[PDB]
Amino acid sequence: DVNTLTRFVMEEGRKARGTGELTQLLNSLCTAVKAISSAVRKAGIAHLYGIAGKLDVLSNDLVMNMLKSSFATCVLVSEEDKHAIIVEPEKRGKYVVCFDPLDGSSNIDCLVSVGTIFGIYRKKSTDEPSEKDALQPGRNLVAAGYALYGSATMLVLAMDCGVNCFMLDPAIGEFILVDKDVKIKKKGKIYSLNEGYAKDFDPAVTEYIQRKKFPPDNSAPYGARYVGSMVADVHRTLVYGGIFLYPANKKSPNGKLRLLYECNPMAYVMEKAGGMATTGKEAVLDVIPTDIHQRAPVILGSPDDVLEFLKVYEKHS
Amino acid sequence: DVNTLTRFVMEEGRKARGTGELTQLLNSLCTAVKAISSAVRKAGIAHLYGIAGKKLDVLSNDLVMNMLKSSFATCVLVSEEDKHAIIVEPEKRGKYVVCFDPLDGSSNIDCLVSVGTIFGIYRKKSTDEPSEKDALQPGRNLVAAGYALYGSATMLVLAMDCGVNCFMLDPAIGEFILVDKDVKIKKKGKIYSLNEGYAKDFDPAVTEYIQRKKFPPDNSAPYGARYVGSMVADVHRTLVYGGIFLYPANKKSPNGKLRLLYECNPMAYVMEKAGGMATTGKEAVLDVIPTDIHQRAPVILGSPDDVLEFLKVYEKHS
Amino acid sequence: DVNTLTRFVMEEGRKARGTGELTQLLNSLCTAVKAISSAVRKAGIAHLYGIAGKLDVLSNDLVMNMLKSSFATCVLVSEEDKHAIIVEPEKRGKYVVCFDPLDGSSNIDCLVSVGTIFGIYRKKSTDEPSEKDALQPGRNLVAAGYALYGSATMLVLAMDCGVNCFMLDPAIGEFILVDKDVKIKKKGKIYSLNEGYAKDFDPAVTEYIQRKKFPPDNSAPYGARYVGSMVADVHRTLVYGGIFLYPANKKSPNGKLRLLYECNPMAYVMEKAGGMATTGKEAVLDVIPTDIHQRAPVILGSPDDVLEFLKVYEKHS
Amino acid sequence: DVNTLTRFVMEEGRKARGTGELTQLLNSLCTAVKAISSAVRKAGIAHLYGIAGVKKLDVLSNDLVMNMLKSSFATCVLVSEEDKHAIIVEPEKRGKYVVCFDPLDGSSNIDCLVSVGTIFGIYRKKSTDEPSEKDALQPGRNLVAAGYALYGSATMLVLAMDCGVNCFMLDPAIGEFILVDKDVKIKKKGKIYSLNEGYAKDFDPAVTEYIQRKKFPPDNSAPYGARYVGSMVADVHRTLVYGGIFLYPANKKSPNGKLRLLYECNPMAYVMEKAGGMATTGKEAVLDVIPTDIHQRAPVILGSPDDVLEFLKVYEKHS
Numbered sequence A, C: 001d002v003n004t005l006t007r008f009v010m011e012e013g014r015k016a017r018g019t020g021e022l023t024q025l026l027n028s029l030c031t032a033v034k035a036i037s038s039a040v041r042k043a044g045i046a047h048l049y050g051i052a053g054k055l056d057v058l059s060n061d062l063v064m065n066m067l068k069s070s071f072a073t074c075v076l077v078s079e080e081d082k083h084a085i086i087v088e089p090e091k092r093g094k095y096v097v098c099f100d101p102l103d104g105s106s107n108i109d110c111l112v113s114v115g116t117i118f119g120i121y122r123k124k125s126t127d128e129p130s131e132k133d134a135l136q137p138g139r140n141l142v143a144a145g146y147a148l149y150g151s152a153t154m155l156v157l158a159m160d161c162g163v164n165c166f167m168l169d170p171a172i173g174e175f176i177l178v179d180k181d182v183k184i185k186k187k188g189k190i191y192s193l194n195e196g197y198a199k200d201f202d203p204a205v206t207e208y209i210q211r212k213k214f215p216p217d218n219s220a221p222y223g224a225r226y227v228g229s230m231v232a233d234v235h236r237t238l239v240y241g242g243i244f245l246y247p248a249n250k251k252s253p254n255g256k257l258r259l260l261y262e263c264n265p266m267a268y269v270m271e272k273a274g275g276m277a278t279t280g281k282e283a284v285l286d287v288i289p290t291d292i293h294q295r296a297p298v299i300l301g302s303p304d305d306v307l308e309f310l311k312v313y314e315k316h317s
Numbered sequence B: 001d002v003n004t005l006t007r008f009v010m011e012e013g014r015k016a017r018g019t020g021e022l023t024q025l026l027n028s029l030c031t032a033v034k035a036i037s038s039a040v041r042k043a044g045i046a047h048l049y050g051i052a053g054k055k056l057d058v059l060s061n062d063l064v065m066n067m068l069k070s071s072f073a074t075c076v077l078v079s080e081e082d083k084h085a086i087i088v089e090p091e092k093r094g095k096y097v098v099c100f101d102p103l104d105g106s107s108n109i110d111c112l113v114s115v116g117t118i119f120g121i122y123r124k125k126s127t128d129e130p131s132e133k134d135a136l137q138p139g140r141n142l143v144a145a146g147y148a149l150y151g152s153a154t155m156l157v158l159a160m161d162c163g164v165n166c167f168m169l170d171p172a173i174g175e176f177i178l179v180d181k182d183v184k185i186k187k188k189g190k191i192y193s194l195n196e197g198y199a200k201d202f203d204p205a206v207t208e209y210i211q212r213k214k215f216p217p218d219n220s221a222p223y224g225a226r227y228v229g230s231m232v233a234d235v236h237r238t239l240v241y242g243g244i245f246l247y248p249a250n251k252k253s254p255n256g257k258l259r260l261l262y263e264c265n266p267m268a269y270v271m272e273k274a275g276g277m278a279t280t281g282k283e284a285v286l287d288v289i290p291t292d293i294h295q296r297a298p299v300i301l302g303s304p305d306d307v308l309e310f311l312k313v314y315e316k317h318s
Numbered sequence D: 001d002v003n004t005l006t007r008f009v010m011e012e013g014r015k016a017r018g019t020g021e022l023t024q025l026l027n028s029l030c031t032a033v034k035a036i037s038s039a040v041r042k043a044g045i046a047h048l049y050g051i052a053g054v055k056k057l058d059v060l061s062n063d064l065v066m067n068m069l070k071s072s073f074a075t076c077v078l079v080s081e082e083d084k085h086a087i088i089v090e091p092e093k094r095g096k097y098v099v100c101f102d103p104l105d106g107s108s109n110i111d112c113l114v115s116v117g118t119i120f121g122i123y124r125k126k127s128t129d130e131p132s133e134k135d136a137l138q139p140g141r142n143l144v145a146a147g148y149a150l151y152g153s154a155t156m157l158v159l160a161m162d163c164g165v166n167c168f169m170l171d172p173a174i175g176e177f178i179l180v181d182k183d184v185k186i187k188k189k190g191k192i193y194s195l196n197e198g199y200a201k202d203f204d205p206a207v208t209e210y211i212q213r214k215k216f217p218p219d220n221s222a223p224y225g226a227r228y229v230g231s232m233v234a235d236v237h238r239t240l241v242y243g244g245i246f247l248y249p250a251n252k253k254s255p256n257g258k259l260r261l262l263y264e265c266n267p268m269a270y271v272m273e274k275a276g277g278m279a280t281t282g283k284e285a286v287l288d289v290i291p292t293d294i295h296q297r298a299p300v301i302l303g304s305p306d307d308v309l310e311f312l313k314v315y316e317k318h319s
């Protein structure tokens, strides 16, 4: 039987005997993602070029407005906003949402794949809503995932029931369920990181990557891929297996990627798919944040690959 | 004034006092590219999944093949998808030879990586009965070439003698809008692009050049690395941002990996028309005289100062 | 604040403390309607004409399959099917749906507006579901409405809370709420019927139309409009006011339109909009059907216009 | 073999050994029509209703056609239903063609989602004078091309030229007009009549008598069916596809009719005649009227020839 994201979300909410608030949140996010996709694919660009005589900001506006009007949220943290956004009293629900509305858009001028990343938390205290409600470890996530605006548009949604992938059919604006309860390969054959900054690598990263290129045994060297857009690289890791790295170094002891709306959602998807996600020192999902924009190192993907990295990392610890 | 690809192609044909045959070819190709984009973005996939109770690379080849055949402008067609050249039936023959990759990068379409269509257009040069040999011309001889990138948005890059022009597909109206005119690549970039998984097989010249990008001998900032693994995506980035793209020979691909006729030559033509460079290491890509329609070539291309720097390192290793 | 069909249907179900079954029904119908619209606008027609080297049937298949897979229905009545469809036991819910999947499609060859009409009943009994469960008067409707595939695509949905109109934004495949709690004009200035049957008209119809052309109170004559597609003509009646008539004639002595999936849903929309719908002898919604494809005469629209027709009708007994 | 509007127009221009100017005109119009279709179907309406936290369609449509035709470099004089005076194209963009068009016909009733359309007629400038409004004052029989786009259940472009009438369906998945009906001809006699019978009290006696013959046939035949969408493009297209007759005649209150000669009557009359149909004012062929004002009105009775001819017999019977 055919299944849509709308039908899937609703049925999961009915199974859980929810009140319907999270379902409305998720319906609203889905509508925003379709609107971002339409804009990313440049529908209407002819009018900008005068036929009748901003993208990251627009994407942030779509998600903010759709989530606010769901009546399901109370605190919203965006890559694009300096402070947490507090929902007006009359529209407050119980959920906290952290999101990157257009990840990878810094290089959107070359039409590289971009994406939307989100993580949904339940507000934990009855206090007046504030940034502190967003300072939860990723292990508290209720749902998380991403939309990839690639060759096609796909929404990957992870919850307690596992990871499910929905393809956007732009003819009818419906996300069609195409991959159910997806699991990552135990060991991959691809490594992904920016090797241009090798002179800054921690010695452990240098040694691990050298082992991927010059394997000590009779195995084939891994292939390399680095799109430079986190959603594209993490999605490829999910589909094909392997390892994605944005690790710490001495000039960046906490990494570069942001914990709340990049690392934690992707770490959550990975673990629900049977993968792993580490800072080197601990699981990404166990980090307790103190700053809504704080950075975290991240190494994620197939467990045998992540564990091999940790073996090398501890050798230099 | 707004300009569409349709209007742009027609006016170039008018200025050249052509008979309209090449205009019909390019209009047919534009229609095929829009149909491929729609399919690549999965329009109608719900029907495939049972909403009412071909492979993408094969469909794309069928779209390009049929639109070019029915243009009456072509006589010989070479596709990545076909072992032998397709010879157009006599009554539909025109004078052009088209080599193309209808869905470049589609081997990894399962992870929704950017894919593209690459094409190069030659005039038939021989007066013989049309055959596979008519596609064996050096890239030197191209009349027009370019690619469609099905990335975050769909763009067509078209190169001819008048230069390189970039058109964005507006999917609301199915129209290619001219958005970047007479494009030129940066003289020198800050990004290098290659699969470093083959580091163990690199010739010394490639190894040293990449070492220079990571550890600059002059203490400037290291280049950033990018490698999508889809040639159209990596080359388009090289065009837009500058830098260098490399697919050199390795042990699995001793003649290189990329295909000369419908990957290297079109991209090399776009690059040179944009003020860039494209070399095999030994010679300009466009000077290679092919002997086989699916033959491979090593390729190093992008900003002129970056390729020239590579070539100096190459000469240092004889 | 923006509102979608998805969000509106979900919120009405929450206010009603429903189990979510009707919501799944309506979302499934929403998906089918977008797919029908896509096909009606001829998306993909180039593939039929050889670019790479039935509509009424497809429309029925879309509605049938989406409703079956909702797990919300037990009996399905379509204009396209001789007998009622009984849903298999594992997919049964409690709702009975009568629909015309592509109303007006007989003239789709001239690109006239066409539509989808639907009416939803609740099955209350523990008997095994059968065709007889669809033999209900329209006053039993839980929800009803129509999708119009006209110059744009609009879904009109009627329930106890009133009538609401949703515009399909095809860039994102989302129905946008654009007209809330719609009420029809008390009196219009347009009458709609096929005057080609003037020779067969009952004396009451003839006299009523004479009053529209030569007004007894010295008012200006009504304008005439007859698209010949029931959904187009009735939607215009809703938006602009006035009257729509399909009375008995010699080829159709019980009228021509179908009671179950044409007259009843439109009569329901009209009454929920403050309008009226009569057979001449009684309200459409009070007719007790004996055959799922039985026909009925219908006069519907603005209340003053229908009441005026009924005055003429009562004059002729 | 599949054929698109772009390819068909280009090949017709090649067959005629044209310079390509008319081809550029038509490509530009095709682009405008796709943009109108997109807006008519309400793409992006979610943004107007606040999804991220403005012109009426008839104005946008006029702006689209005006700008696309200007930038074709193929036109010199433009007449629109929306503009009191003809637009004279600035010198650097001038071509030889005169275009009269209605950018969104029937749009006054667009609020009920009734079918709407675009109508156009293309002339060559005949005078050696500086271009002016007078260059649009040509009889319809001078038309080089004419036709219409109907934004109905699907969007179709009907294009008439000397080679006949051809119908192209817009495939919105790819923005291509697909040739679906070639060298169209209308039925010799139909079974539908189309006019606003609510104003029967104002009818001319000939019209009254003719419509009476359709409802109460004297020859024991079946009465005609009635259809009246109230959008000219929709009613005329149905007349082309199914046959029959469409009427907006002159009456006692409107001695010149209501529809506009230059950009409503002439193009539809031209399409009709190229399809083997007829189009008359009652007194003469629409295509023979020589206009004196670009917004002048004309009565129109058009469609299947046996029906128009029957109408004219009744009309002449009443002198």
Ligand SMILES: CC(C)Cc1sc(N)nc1-c1ccc(P(=O)(O)O)o1
Residues within 6 Å of the ligand: A009, A010, A012, A013, A014, A016, A017, A018, A019, A020, A021, A022, A023, A026, A094, A142, A143, A159, A160, A161
């Ligand atoms: C395990 C999953 C996340 C449960 C789901 S899945 C969905 N659509 N809704 C819920 C849910 C539970 C409670 C509530 P609520 O009372 O806050 O709405 O919703």
Ligand SMILES: CC(C)Cc1sc(N)nc1-c1ccc(P(=O)(O)O)o1
Residues within 6 Å of the ligand: B009, B010, B012, B013, B014, B016, B017, B018, B019, B020, B021, B022, B023, B026, B143, B144, B160, B161, B162
């Ligand atoms: C420099 C460019 C390639 C010239 C162009 S650009 C276009 N649309 N057509 C032509 C062209 C020249 C000759 C012919 P033809 O007589 O084969 O048709 O066409």
Ligand SMILES: CC(C)Cc1sc(N)nc1-c1ccc(P(=O)(O)O)o1
Residues within 6 Å of the ligand: C009, C010, C012, C013, C014, C016, C017, C018, C019, C020, C021, C022, C023, C026, C142, C143, C159, C160, C161
């Ligand atoms: C008055 C309106 C129609 C009530 C609505 S509105 C909506 N979306 N659902 C319902 C509803 C009631 C009962 C059930 P259920 O337990 O069969 O699902 O649903």
Ligand SMILES: CC(C)Cc1sc(N)nc1-c1ccc(P(=O)(O)O)o1
Residues within 6 Å of the ligand: D009, D010, D012, D013, D014, D016, D017, D018, D019, D020, D021, D022, D023, D026, D144, D145, D161, D162, D163
């Ligand atoms: C009979 C038809 C109208 C001929 C056609 S059909 C088309 N696409 N162009 C032309 C045409 C003739 C002259 C010119 P021009 O030199 O003004 O461009 O064009």
